[PDB]
UniProtKB/Swiss-Prot annotation, chains A, B, C:
Keywords: Bacterial microcompartment, Metal-binding, Zinc. Has 2 BMC domains which can evolve independently of each other. GO terms for biological process: ethanolamine catabolic process. This is Bacterial microcompartment shell protein EutL. The lineage of its organism: Bacteria, Pseudomonadati, Pseudomonadota, Gammaproteobacteria, Enterobacterales. The record marks D52, E76 as: Part of the acidic patch lining the small pore. Ethanolamine 1 binds at D44, E76, F106, T175, N176, Y177. Ethanolamine 2 binds at D45. Zn(2+) binds at E150. Pathway: Amine and polyamine degradation; ethanolamine degradation. The gene is eutL.
Length: 209, 209, 209
């Protein structure tokens, strides 16, 4: 039913202990990045949040305008974690696995379960999400995802309900899911997530008034 | 069967009476644009034509290289209508609804109904379709859509049969539907639509000679 | 089962004996290109290889960062062959047909047949594949395609096993299939294809260790 969690899955995982030199150049890896962790999953934004969380928990970095939406996805969502040795890379992958299976999650917008949404607060951003313009390393953030009409209406509602700012905005392309990042205090990001959720549920209930 | 109409549907609709100031800046709305109409449908090009028609019927504007094809689409096709007040915005949405449900339409190219096409004359363009290079505000236009091989062959056939010009051309990306806009007198655009249709039916009948 | 061939199909074909002048300008055709061959198929990379092969077998040319993957595809994969007359164009299309139906092929990575891959050596490149940076006209080449995690791991394995170089690399976008082109001697490209295949089979067997 409405507000029940969707739980994604990890589809494949491998570690490259020592990247080939020619491949390292083509990937433009920094000299300190020797090893590479590869993980694929069937959800877009939950994987992205898990990746950012890994950057705080291990000595790894990820090697905005991407695909967004819940599981199952059309294909593989791949993240490449780069690190100084295979142990740090494995620590990063373990953090990602843990957060994909028991971290942020999409929810159903209605009882029919034809529409989903994500409304999640990242209390402290790592190096991946803070790469976006307007998001500072360590600051909190509201991560909002919905179908484009619901997203637009919800974003407007969130900005009106809470003391938050739109970090950056790129409008929807035909797409199935669009995302938005809001910035402000931790409590204000929570209020924005609650207001975003109410707007999405309202439209999912009665899409044509 | 062949030439029967496909009828799309409106999936969701909302009006924002007064857009949040921060959101207005991110959407780069002109100062006279105070209100916002949101409508989503399951067809690409029929919705786009309906949007252009709304710009003539109300004081609204839409806030080429997009998705093209018939219903049902993979996700939501969203249009945002911007206007000076909620009454004009509602007038625009009412015009769109009317033209989505009884205006331009895709048709089946064969009796098996595995392939569709659009061949429609816009007798007087509004401000949305005339934003394309080579299309002048108020002038007529042939709006042609088909699968990429059929589209290419049909466009060549249309240009040969009627006194029309290719307004602008971007080749197909793997895609399922590509579009073309032709320019000329109202009668010449009609002849181009008839010739485009004949070529599509011919290929849909006997794709490999 | 694993390593069994996937066989694609030709979906539609037409020849334009004499391209309309306005259409020729929009397609930016050279003055010697008078005729146009249109062919659509349900596989991405097998069609691309067939197109390159046609450039050696006929007086035609094709009018990297495209769609990749096996059949069936979401829509039509179109190739336009441009040539000096309809006879040369027909010779090009006949070469493409022959190579789509009995040339390069994707294979299943596992017995469940949920994942496919392509590992093929082009012994002598024509004018189409050699348009890529780092590929010289007439030189051999390894053409590698797999799902993004398998592709990444396989490319690293290929570079380590054989005396080959990565011609050019663009990382995966959410995607279902990514491609890589390797350069070197004919025998070294074969060894790279064998090593790429072993890595893909290994992951397809045991994706999570
Ligand atoms: Cl990072
Ligand atoms: Cl407009
Ligand atoms: Cl070529």
């Amino acid at each position: 039913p409405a507000l029940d969690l969707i739980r994604p899955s990890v589809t494949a995982m491998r570690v490259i202990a020592s990247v080939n030199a020619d491949f390292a150049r083509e990937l433009k890896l920094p000299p300190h990045i020797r090893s590479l962790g590869l993980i694929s999953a069937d959800s877009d934004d939950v994987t992205y949040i898990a990746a950012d969380e890994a950057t705080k928990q291990a000595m790894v970095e990820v090697v905005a305008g991407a695909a967004h939406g819940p599981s199952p996805t059309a294909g593989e969502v791949l993240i490449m974690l780069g690190g100084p040795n295979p142990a740090e890379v494995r620590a990063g992958l373990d953090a990602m696995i843990a957060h994909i299976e028991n971290g942020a999650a999409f929810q159903w917008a209605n009882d029919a379960q034809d529409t989903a949404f994500l409304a999640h607060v990242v209390s402290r951003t790592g190096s991946y999400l803070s790469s976006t313009a307007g998001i500072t390393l360590g600051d909190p953030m509201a991560y909002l995802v919905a179908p484009p009409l619901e997203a637009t209406y919800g974003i407007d509602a969130a900005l009106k309900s809470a003391d938050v700012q739109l970090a950056t905005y790129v409008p929807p392309p035909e797409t199935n899911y669009s995302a938005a990042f809001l910035t402000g205090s931790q409590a204000a990001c929570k209020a924005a997530c609650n207001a975003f959720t109410d707007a999405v549920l309202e439209i999912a209930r009665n899409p044509i008034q």
